[PDB]
Structure formats: C-alpha cells, structure tokens
Structure 1
C-alpha cells in the first residue's frame, strides 16, 4: 500500500531537484546579464555627461559667432 506512495514521493523529489538545478542555472544567467547591463549603463552614463558639455560649449560658441557676424 505504502510502496506506491513512496515511489511517487521519490519521483516528485527527483523532479523538484531537477527544477532546483534549472532554477540555479537560470539565476546565474540572469545575474551575469544584470552585471553586464550595469557595467554598460555605467560607461554610458559617465560618457553622456561629456557629450552634453561638449554640445553646450559648441552651441555657446555658435551663439557668440552669430552675434559677432551680426
């Protein structure tokens, strides 16, 4: 009577262990992707400020050149 229940419990335990291993693999992949995205966004946000200041200086020089032209 109890042998079938024991076999089912063993099978579901094996399935749970396989699901746990798959979950660990997916978690590791997601963490690696998140770290890569964080590094990329850090570089992007540290170079966008330089781009913004460059364009601001360019437009200020444009304005003063236009004034002198007038």
Structure 2
C-alpha cells in the first residue's frame, strides 16, 4: 500500500507537477497576454488621449 500509494502519490505528484508545468505555461501565456493587454489598453487609452486631445 505504501508502494502503491507511492506509485500513485508520485503519479499524483507527477500529474500535479505536470499541471504545474501546464499551468506554468498558462501563466507565461496569460502573463504575456496580460502585459500585451495592458499595452493594448494603454494603446487604446493613449489613442483615446490623442483622439480626445484631437477633440
């Protein structure tokens, strides 16, 4: 049972770590998309400032 739980705990650890790795990818991907979204937002807002300024 300790060994089976070990295979399963190690599997769970592997799966949890695999999820951390998939999730590390989700972070890098969403993190970059957020930095980009913040830049897109800043861009829209800068355009807004220029358009409003134009107004």
When normalised by structure 2's length, the TM-score is 0.64
Change (3 A) 1:67 1:43: same
- The structure with the larger Rg is 1
Match of 1:36 in 2: 15
Find the aligned partners of 1:62 and 1:28 in 2 and give their Cα distance. Answer: 48
- Identify if the C-alpha distance between structure 1 residues 66 and 25 changes in structure 2 by more than 3 Å, giving closer, same or farther: closer
Structure 2: 5+ residue stretches without partners: 49-55
Root mean square deviation, CA, Å: 1.6
Tell me the distance in 1 between the aligned counterparts of 2:2 and 2:42: 58
Give me the whole-angstrom Cα distance separating, in 2, the residues matched to 1:62 and 1:24: 53
Could you state the TM-score of these two structures normalised by the residue count of structure 1? 0.54
